[PDB]
Structures are given as structure tokens and as C-alpha cells.
């Protein structure tokens with residue numbers, strides 16, 4: 451493969467500060483929203499939002515991500531049955547006292563109404579390896595990190611397009627959800643995002659983010 | 671902690687589509703750039719771009735990320751020695767034939783001039799656990815996925831601010847770099863981004879991203 455010159459849009463120092471400031475204020479309004487309206491969302495916003503995720507870097511240019519988008523209420527309800535079943539066992543037994551205590555501030559439990567109400571579910575699967583045209587396995591270097599980076603870009607895109615979601619990681623729901631949606635064995639579910647508008651009764655925990663001097667360290 | 675109403679941001683469906691289209695076109699221009707000018711960048715843009723990263727979701731709201739920013743020519747050079755030294759061993763022995771063959775199309779080698787030329791290096795450390803005020807360890811659920819999500823948001827923010835970078839994972843360099851920059855034992859380096867304007871003669875591999883129908887699957 452050939453190498454080509456890199457073409458860049460140069461911004462004046464003042465334009466950069468402004469764009470960077472606005473983008474921060476924009477994304478800082480993003481909250482994980484666990485209460486989602488059933489009102490339909492324009493499918494072109496979803497398409498672009500996933501196109502964008504696919505612009506993520508990936509280890510050795512492997513693109514090890516599958517974004518499975520579920521619209522069908524029937525399928526969605528089967529997903530809800532599975533996750534609620536496993537989460538109940540997760541809260542009652544598998545996560546442990548410490549974890550369950552650490553979640554009190556979020557008031558979450560194994561009841562997940564948004565899996566039904568949200569018009570759209572995005573299930574993100576990592577490809578723990580891939581296949582070339584000849585059918586031999588190609589290695590997916592840092593696939594979990596690559597897909598997660600892509601999930602970050604997906605989250606920014608949803609915020610930018612004015613939709614809401616919550617990044618969820620349903621423990622022990624992977625194999626079952628994989629089988630239900632007909633995904634191949636080399637795919638493993640990494641996380642699930644319900645996407646839509648906030649329902650009228652939406653709340654969030656009153657969480658505070660660290661001040662800059664607590665996430666950033668400058669060295670001299 | 672109390673729970674509060676979530677404030678709905680109201681967009682017309684069409685403005686939403688327009689925003690989603692523009693954001694895709696913006697991020698699709700992002701490329702990993704391994705040739706970086708030494709032209710200084712405004713530290714406020716860095717501050718904002720890192721603020722943005724800190725708005726990322728995190729498992730049970732743990733915010734397990736430390737963004738170390740290195741400006742100092744001297745420290746940067748010590749980092750360069752470390753990474754070039756280890757990458758040489760990586761290409762010659764530790765990565766293996768297949769991996770080295772897989773990197774040919776990128777024309778990368780163990781020489782990393784950008785580590786000196788770039789005005790700023792951002793080293794992203796995951797906190798594999800934390801400490802409460804009482805000195806007991808708190809658990810950082812999915813810290814690596816969380817930090818990676820933050821890095822994704824970071825990459826978008828840099829792209830939006832007209833800065834460039836390449837997402838790097840310097841094999842076996844974590845411990846030496848941790849000690850060099852005086853980071854506590856609960857921090858582990860996840861990746862390194864050289865940040866700045868692209869140098870004049872910068873190139874990129876002519877890579878193609880998958881079409882939408884190859885990363886997205888819709889279900890009924």
C-alpha cells in the first residue's frame with residue numbers, strides 16, 4: 451500500500467481555543483441516562499453516529515468492531531428478558547457486597563425498562579480475531595482497547611447529535627446475546643447502549659466530575 | 671447522593687441529522703499522524719481537550735484516569751530513549767514475525783522522532799485501583815475500558831481542535847515510564863499520544879475504512 455501527503459485544515463490559535471471550549475461544554479452536558487422515551491429517532495442520525503465510530507484508530511488497522519443495531523421490539527424484549535435474568539443473579543450473588551454497595555449512589559438494579567422503551571439498542575461486539583479473504587485468521591492487536599476507543603467516539607457522536615444513552619456492561623449476558631443475534635464465535639459483546647430521547651421522567655445521579663488539576667499532571 | 675432531573679436539550683430532527691453528518695465528516699478526516707511539527711500549541715487547548723476527556727463515563731463513576739502532559743524537552747528525550755530502546759527489542763524479537771509483517775503497510779520502525787519534535791506528549795495512565803480518604807483501596811470497575819473510552823473522547827477533541835496525534839501502545843515501557851514521571855504504583859500506562867500540528871512533509875498510509883454495511887448490522 452502507498453503513502454500519501456497529509457492534508458490538514460489549519461485553525462488560528464484563537465479559533466482553536468474557541469472550538470475546544472465549545473466541544474468541552476457540549477460533551478460535559480452528556481450524562482448516562484437510564485430512562486429513555488419510546489419516540490422514534492431518525493435512522494440517519496444512527497447511521498452517521500456509527501459511521502463516525504468506524505473512524506476510530508485500530509491496532510494495525512484491523513477495525514475489529516461490529517455494531518449490531520436492534521430496532522425490532524420483539525428482539526429487544528428477548529434481550530431484556532436475558533439481561534434482567536442475569537443481572538438479578540448479579541445483584542443478589544455474583545457481584546458481591548462491595549460492588550453492590552458501590553452502586554447505591556446510582557440507584558440501579560436489575561430492572562431495565564429502557565431495553566424495551568428505547569427505540570434503538572446498539573450492541574458493540576469486539577472481534578477478538580478476524581479473517582482474511584483466504585480464510586486464515588488475522589490477529590486483532592489490542593482489539594478490546596480499539597473497540598472501546600471507538601465506543602468513546604460513538605458516545606461523543608450521540609451527544610453531538612442530541613441523543614442520549616447509558617454505557618452498559620451486562621455481566622454474563624454475552625454468550626446468550628451473541629447466540630440470540632446470530633453473531634459468529636469470534637465476536638464477543640463488549641457493551642450495550644440503549645439510544646433515544648430522554649423520557650419525561652428522566653433523572654440522573656447528582657455526580658460531580660473531578661476538577662482539571664485532579665485528572666491532569668504537567669511535568670517539568 | 672441525591673438524584674436530580676436531567677435537562678433535555680431540544681433539537682429539531684433535521685438539525686440533528688445535519689449535526690450528525692458534519693461530525694462524521696469531521697472525524698473521518700482524522701488520521702494517525704506520525705510526523706509532527708515542533709510549532710508550539712496553546713496550553714489552553716490542551717487543558718480543554720483533557721477536560722473533555724474527563725467528561726467520559728466511567729464504571730461506577732470512578733474516573734480512573736490520569737493524563738500526564740509532558741512539555742519539557744529533557745523529559746521528552748528520556749522518554750524517547752526508553753521507547754526507541756524497547757521498540758527495537760520489540761521489532762527484533764518480542765512482537766514476532768506475523769505482527770512485524772502486519773505492520774509493514776504502515777512503514778513504522780523503532781525510530782520515533784515525533785517524541786522529541788512534538789511540543790507535547792500526553793501519557794494516559796489507567797488507575798487499576800484507587801484509595802479512599804481513609805486509606806482503604808477502592809475498586810475501579812472496568813478501568814481499562816473506561817480509560818480507553820476517555821481516550822476515544824480525547825482523540826475526537828484533538829480532531830475538533832485541529833491538532834493531530836497517533837495513538838501508540840509502547841510495549842513493555844510502562845514501568846520505566848511510570849518511575850521516570852513519578853507516578854504512583856496504582857497507575858499503569860495505557861497509551862501515549864504525541865500532540866501538535868502535522869509537520870509540512872507529513873504523510874499517511876493510503877488506508878481505506880470499511881463501508882457502513884461492513885461494521886453495522888441491523889436486526890428484525
Ligand SMILES: Cc1cc2nc3c(=O)[nH]c(=O)nc-3n(C[C@H](O)[C@H](O)[C@H](O)COP(=O)(O)O)c2cc1C
Nearest residue numbers: 481482617618619620727728729730731812815816
Ligand atoms: C465500562 C463502563 C461500564 C458501565 N456499565 C454500566 C452498567 O452496567 N450499568 C449502568 O447503569 N451504567 C454503566 N456505566 C455508566 C456509569 O455508571 C456512568 O458513566 C457513571 O455513573 C458516571 O455517570 P455519567 O456517565 O452520567 O457521567 C458504565 C460505564 C463504563 C465506562
Ligand SMILES: Cc1cc2nc3c(=O)[nH]c(=O)nc-3n(C[C@H](O)[C@H](O)[C@H](O)COP(=O)(O)O)c2cc1C
Nearest residue numbers: 507508509510511592595596701702778837838839
Ligand atoms: C490500541 C491501539 C494501539 C495502537 N498502537 C500504535 C503503535 O504502537 N504505533 C503506531 O504507529 N500506531 C499505533 N496505533 C495506530 C494504528 O496503527 C492506526 O490507527 C491504524 O493504522 C489506522 O490508521 P488511522 O488511525 O489513521 O485510521 C494504535 C491504535 C490503537 C487503536
Ligand SMILES: N[C@@H](Cc1ccc(O)c(I)c1)C(=O)O
Nearest residue numbers: 509510511591773778779839
Ligand atoms: N508500537 C510499535 C509497533 C506498532 C506500530 C503500529 C501499530 O498499529 C501497532 I498495534 C504496533 C511502534 O510504535 O512502531
Ligand SMILES: N[C@@H](Cc1ccc(O)c(I)c1)C(=O)O
Nearest residue numbers: 558559619620729730731811
Ligand atoms: N450492570 C449492572 C450493574 C452496574 C450498574 C452501574 C455501573 O456503573 C456498573 I460498573 C455495574 C446494571 O446495569 O445495573
